[PDB]
């Protein structure tokens, strides 16, 4: 017929060829964009003389381009929201002047309803659930019921059973429909008939199904939403599905790519948080004996550990790592150690912050006692004072000694289990595994809430580790790399029979890349960026976290005594993915057995004293220097606890 009808038919053909799963997602977006080019080009030449069929076609094309746009992390893409808004406006204009048959009305109302479903899922404030319910009722009373040949009708029925109305006359078609997936059947059994058994095996079938679906596919978000729905009204079924969704998420977030598939598809902090909740409340129930409850706290420990840092673990290579750093800034890119294998006299403290529950967690493990325990605490005022110190230190470096005192004093007040004998007994070495907020906190300098409370390093040996898989199961020489001015930091450390292999004065970046696995001692300046571009002020520009990952292949197994200013606290104040991006972390990642990195700005004398500590190649050094005088002189507390022990022996 007219050019309008021909172009509409072409758009329909393209939308059909892009909707089916047979079309690869690589060449799926382009087809939708081409069809929508045709549709909007047709619309631009006739603003109001346009038929309702073209309006509903444009709405469907906008829906299709919206569903193929996937969430990019903690923030929903704005192209998806714009596509939904345009589609809903176009379908509203279609139904305002509808001039079609009954089938056309059915299709228009179905498209509008599914667009409203996705818009409510994305932006609930604009399209509230009451108007969504009204639109869904108007759609279903107009014939939007066919579940055998229209999956959108299945979505509408599921949303209705969410909303709180009965469909006893539709379950027969809902369950026998081939298009319905495991989640649709689970919703049908849980809401239509208020059953829990058939819902349970269909639910476990869904759990098994998630083991192969990528983290980008919407079924993960649907499952998490359904778990929250089961959590809203107290149910006994969300425990098991939380556990199995956790298991599937672990087995799946091991095959995705770090380059362009992990920053913005691991949006499942809620999932791990609520799996932690499920395990905790299962362990909260009374048990006949301490043999399973004591073992569920270990499961809590793996809940905490499996989410912290997976980007760093799997870190030419330079091009891929440059792609990674580009993708960090929201730009465009073109075995594991057993937790029970801990040396004697060592206690490991795992950490997790629950965003859903609003409380923190702490999992300990006394190797001698073989005991796992958990305690709760708040993390809001801690975040307050952490940001306070970080801001007042960025503005005024050394003047933030008072804020170090305040933060470390209130850490013990809000975290009293650190000094508790039952939680962490005296004497045993403590290894910390923080979660996205406590990494930057100097937990080794935590001050007990007492009248004259001492430190944590005073009565324990602290060691930091970004995760648990970092720990894993040489030459006796020593090397020194110095790039300070030849006016200070000389003493006898420059020439005290260090080593003829690679000890240098005014060293360059290339020198650090040619070492023979020695306990490298490094005394230069670092800056810290914001990304993980925290440079080290070697000659010829300097070596960066990028360069440390790419080039340094000689410091494997070394005990680095790196004393550069602002090394351990390189990562910014706010968290993104619970990944620690310090220079000391980089050295630990490339294969070092331990790094005493400096958190904030340090001084030459302190670095020399740490270097002079050649008793055995720390904490006792911190005790001797005057780290216990935080209440007598905050300035000397500023320059002492900056050095922290990173690594596991």
């Amino acid at each position: 017929p007219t050019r309008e009808d021909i172009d509409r038919k072409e758009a329909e053909r393209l939308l059909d060829e892009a909707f089916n799963p047979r079309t690869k997602p690589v060449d799926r977006k382009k087809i939708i964009n081409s069809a929508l080019k045709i549709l909007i080009g047709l619309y631009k030449e006739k603003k109001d003389d346009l038929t309702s069929a073209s309006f509903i076609s444009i709405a469907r094309a906008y829906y299709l381009v919206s569903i193929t746009i996937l969430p990019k992390g903690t923030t929903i893409p704005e192209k998806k929201k714009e596509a939904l808004r345009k589609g809903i406006e176009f379908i509203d204009r279609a139904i305002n002047k509808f001039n079609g048959s009954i089938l056309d009305s059915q299709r228009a109302f179905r498209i509008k309803s599914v667009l409203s479903i996705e818009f409510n899922r994305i932006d609930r404030e604009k399209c509230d659930n009451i108007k969504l319910k009204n639109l869904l009722n108007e759609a279903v009373d107009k014939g939007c019921t066919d579940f055998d040949t229209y999956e959108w009708d299945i979505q509408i029925a599921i949303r209705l059973c969410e909303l709180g109305v009965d469909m006893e006359g539709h379950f027969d078609n809902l369950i026998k429909s081939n298009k319905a997936n495991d989640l649709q059947k689970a919703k049908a059994y849980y809401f239509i008939k208020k059953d829990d058994h058939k819902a349970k095996e269909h639910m476990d079938k869904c759990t098994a199904s998630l083991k192969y679906t990528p983290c980008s596919h919407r079924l993960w978000d649907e499952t998490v939403g359904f778990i929250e729905r089961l959590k809203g009204d107290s149910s006994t079924l969300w425990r098991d599905f939380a556990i199995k969704t956790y298991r599937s998420c672990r087995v799946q977030e091991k095959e995705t790519g770090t380059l362009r598939l992990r920053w913005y598809w691991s949006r499942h902090r809620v999932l791990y948080d609520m799996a932690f909740l499920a395990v905790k409340e299962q362990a909260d129930d009374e048990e006949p004996d301490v043999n399973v409850k004591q073992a569920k706290i270990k499961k809590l420990a793996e809940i905490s550990d499996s989410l912290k840092s997976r980007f760093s673990l799997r870190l030419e290579f330079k091009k891929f790592l440059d792609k990674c750093v580009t993708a960090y800034q929201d730009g465009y890119v073109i075995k594991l150690l057993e937790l029970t294998q801990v040396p004697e006299g060592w206690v490991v403290v795992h950490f997790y912050l629950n965003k859903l529950e609003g409380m923190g967690n702490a999992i300990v493990f006394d190797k001698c006692a073989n005991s796992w325990q958990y305690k709760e605490f708040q993390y809001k005022e801690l975040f307050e004072v952490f940001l306070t110190w970080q801001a007042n230190y960025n503005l005024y470096k050394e003047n933030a000694a008072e804020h170090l005192v305040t933060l470390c004093k209130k850490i013990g007040e809000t975290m009293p289990f650190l000094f508790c004998d039952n939680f962490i007994p005296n004497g045993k070495d403590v290894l910390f595994v923080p979660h996205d907020f406590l990494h930057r906190l100097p937990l080794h300098g935590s001050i007990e809430n007492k009248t004259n409370g001492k430190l944590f390093l005073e009565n324990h040996s602290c060691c930091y580790l970004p995760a648990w898989s970092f720990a894993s199961e040489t030459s006796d020489e020593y090397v020194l790399l110095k790039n300070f001015d030849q006016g200070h930091f000389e003493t006898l450390q420059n020439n005290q029979i260090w080593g003829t292999q690679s000890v240098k004065d005014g060293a360059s970046s290339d020198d650090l890349e040619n070492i023979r696995n020695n306990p490298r001692l490094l005394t230069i300046l670092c800056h810290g960026e914001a990304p993980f571009r925290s440079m080290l002020k070697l000659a010829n520009g300097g070596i960066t976290y990028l360069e440390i990952l790419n080039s340094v292949k000689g410091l494997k197994g070394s005990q680095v005594i790196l004393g550069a200013c602002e090394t351990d606290l390189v990562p910014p104040l706010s968290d993104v993915m619970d990944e620690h991006y310090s220079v000391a972390t980089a050295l630990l990642l490339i294969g070092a057995a331990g790094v005493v990195g400096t958190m904030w700005k340090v001084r030459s004398n302190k670095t020399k004293s740490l270097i002079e500590w050649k008793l055995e190649n720390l904490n006792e050094w911190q005790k001797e220097t005057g780290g216990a005088a935080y209440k007598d002189h905050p300035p000397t507390f500023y320059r002492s606890i900056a050095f922290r022990s990173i690594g596991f022996p």
């Binding site: 714009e82 808004r85 345009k86 800034q329 007042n392 503005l395 005024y396 914001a530 571009r533």
Partner: protein, 1191 residues
Amino acid sequence: MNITVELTFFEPYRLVEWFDWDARKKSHSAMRGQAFAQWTWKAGKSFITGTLVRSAVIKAVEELLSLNNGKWEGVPCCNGSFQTDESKGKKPSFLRKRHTLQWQANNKNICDKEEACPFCILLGRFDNAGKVHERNKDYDIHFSNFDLDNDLRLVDIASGRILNRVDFDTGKAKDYFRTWEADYETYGTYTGRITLRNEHAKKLLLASLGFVDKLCGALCRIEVIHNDELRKQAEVIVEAFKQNDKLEKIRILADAIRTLRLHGEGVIEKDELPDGKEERDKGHHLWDIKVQGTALRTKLKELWQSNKDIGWRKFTEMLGSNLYLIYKKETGVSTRFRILGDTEYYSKAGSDLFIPVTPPEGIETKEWIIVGRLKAATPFYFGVQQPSDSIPGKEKKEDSLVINEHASFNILLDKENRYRIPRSALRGALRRDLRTAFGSGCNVSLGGQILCNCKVCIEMRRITLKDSVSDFSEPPEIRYRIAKNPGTATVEDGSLFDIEVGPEGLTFPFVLRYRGHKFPEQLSSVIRYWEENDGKNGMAWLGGLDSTGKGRFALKDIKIFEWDLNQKINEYIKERGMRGKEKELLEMGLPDGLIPYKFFEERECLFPYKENLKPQWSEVQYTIEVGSPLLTADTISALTEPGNRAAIAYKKRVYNDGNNAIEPEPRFAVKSETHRGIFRTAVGRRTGDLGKEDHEDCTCDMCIIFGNEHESSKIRFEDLELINGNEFEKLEKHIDHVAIDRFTGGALDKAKFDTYPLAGSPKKPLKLKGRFWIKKGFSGDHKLLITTALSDIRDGLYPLGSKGGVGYGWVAGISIDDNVPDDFKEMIGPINNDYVHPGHQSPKIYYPHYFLDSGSKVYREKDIITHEEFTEELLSGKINCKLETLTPLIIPDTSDENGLKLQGNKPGHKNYKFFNINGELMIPGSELRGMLRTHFEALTKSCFAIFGEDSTLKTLGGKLDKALHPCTGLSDGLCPGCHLFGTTDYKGRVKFGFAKYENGPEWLITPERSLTLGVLESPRPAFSIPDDESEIPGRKFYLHHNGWRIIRQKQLEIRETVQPERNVTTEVMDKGNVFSFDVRFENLREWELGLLLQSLDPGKNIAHKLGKGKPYGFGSVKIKIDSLHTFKIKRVPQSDIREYINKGYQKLIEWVLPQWHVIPHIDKLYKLLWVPFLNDYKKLGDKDNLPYKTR
């Protein structure tokens, strides 16, 4: 004590719709514009909330008291309170999420509702003030609303704006947002009341009023105690134009009317519009035509006589817009609407955190004020959305498609139509420069619950800079831009648009304020980078279209001052920081305090300067010499100003900075867009990436260097201006071009075209100066590629300007300036055919000029050889030629119709002079191009590309066979002649040049040295085809018999016997004058080059024709080849150019030395070009004389 508070805004501020605290969440704009003024609908009234000025005063008092360590004339102050919901709730309507400045001790007493501190009482802590509605004016301190000082209409106070957010790693901006920019001149004064019941804190309140400098996004002071008839006329004129079937050129009338605003009222009152040709008796094709009877030159005069009230600027702009819209309605009006990626983001987004920031006691804080002048070394652009979109109130137009206005790219002008430099653009440029200097910054986040503590963000939180307006309220010149199709080296379809650029040299005042503890090293680096020192040249890339080269501001007259905030804050309060009085600081050399900065570091003292900013952009200034006329074809500007020149050269309109306004003398230049495009095409053709299927995720050697649809360009160009103009005295040379008919041999029905380019000769070329910048991220390969592109420019392959095929803009060389980087600077006999054609038709009645028949068959090469990267198989290079004349050559110079100055003896007698530029005798390139193109077309029976149809004495177009018609678009196919010399939608692959003699005898001696001529009457096609029964005669050619001796003998016997004033007499060459011209070629096959060679020098005893008097024997030319340079420079062997001409003959034969006489049409062609001089009109037309006249 009631205190009356007034406002005086000194830069355009913003206002938003009222809504309400419950309704602010529903509308994202209202939530975004909480810190903006409020607008109401009653046209409506405007005001600002007392809570907003309350928040400003609270920030002022907290910062002011932190400045003085919490002590203010004796009374100590405490920390105050900014945390709510500690006991019950009722959260404040506003959330801080800002680093509150807290104090060292601030320990005086635990203040309660008996002895509230001055800051506490200003906060209204212990009063009866609530947080629900009000219900009474019982506040201890009250901040009432401030109202403007007759139901004013909405648009009269505000105009919409679209601010932007440009990414740093890329150049693309990810998102934008709306804005309701208001006026600060007339509707910029507000009026309100503030009450203070407690007398104990009046001083703090007055000090806060004097200290606040941030309100509604604008610097402010606190004071205590028609077109309807034009639419009809446009419709009338458009309808009248359509009635003449001349509606196609109504938009150029709209563009001409829009350009006419640059000229004063005298262009229409004094009738200064071009009068057309002197004796045309028809007038200009656009101006001097009749609309509804009356002449348009007078019709527009009457229309303006009815419209004095609006003004010349408004009248011209409205007339142009109305004409454009009426044309668009009957071309539909083009409408624009994006699908996606039009993100209008505000980040509406409760952590409700509180961060106390304690500065060390005794910190030395000072507030530096920067005053200067932002001279635009290049034309500047500041993007503003189209008119009727910037109208406030008529927004949200949701899935609505907007209407395209006349100007595709507007520039930011204020209400009085003077160029304005916005706060946002300069702030963004400062952000980019600061991030470059630091090397570590944050991509700005929107709606972030906690302030960014990155280096660049900290220093801009203490930077405030004011909007500036240039004192030049004069219309902006319009710089058109076109897009070239790499496939055919022609215009991309639907890819023409206009750009509104301001004149270079305008003095924008520059104000920058830094309120910190130490003047940052990086800001000093930025200022020195922006400074226009002796050799710094200024590096403030400010504005948009930086890739083209628009917006390079050169900061000058820089003066740095500073108050001492710790001890001289009362002076700051008293003089209000001199906000709005920024001009007075330039002349002064001074108020109390404000000692000038003496510790301002120099350029070669700043470490971050040399580290990051100095290498950031490396200038490469180089001069291009062209020995040929240069033309840029500013056609719209040509339809104005006296001269009646169809295509004048593009002239920049420079503005003298500080001098007496604008410079009357123009500055001819090549557009920076042309320079950028020529370099981009060079790298694309040398890299093989032009013409690619798509550039979706491409990372080729062109997207990286010259940017792409998403990334910014890493190389920014500039204007290729002319510096050799003061020693010409004939800078503009008038050259005429006429399209010769292939049948009649004369001018077509509509073919005359006069071009008006610059001067330029091999002995006096034009020195074109221009520069381009290089980003400090290029490896060796990219710099090598750009150097090879520059060398290819030097080698002469790519001609600047237009009509490069004729020879315009042919470069003679490049001289790199000595200031270029060292790495860049260091890295940058004759063949005579032995063929002899006897031509023995009659070696021992006559015909004037016999015709040539070639047949209707034609081969159309549908596989067009694209103008993309050079084909490896194909051969590209240069041809040098030696030109000699067997008969005297006559080529007039129309630029001076009285060159011989012989009008005294007989006025009205045309007397031309031989063509020459700058006094160097020269053959125009068009002559050689048309000559050899006609020769090649007849050789290959190409087509009749130029044909004079629509003539009877029916079947005006049916006489010619319907197979050899002039070629349409590429769909049908292109002739070999059309494949080589080109056509519309396909640029030719062979470019011709200009012939310089520099040899042989001087002139011909017979008014001196110039023999007269007979009357050259119009060609008559009727004689060639007498009867309608005949189909058509073929191509017409002229013989070579020396009839010029008859004219040289009877010169006096014909210059007075007949045609006393109808004849033309111009000087001629002599026999055996040796010329030299170059015939370049790009991407030619073997047989193409062979056939071109045989067209140039087919062999001995064969010569072409040039100039006037071809039937009279004048102008026969002999061409010889010196060197066939070819690059894939290499000289091909002189063995008769084997495998090139031979392959040409081999491919021609379907349609040892070869035998051209075997082919019949080739035989006739070469007979018509035989020269028998190496060694030794009414009775004919009778019906009984010769019915069948043949060729």
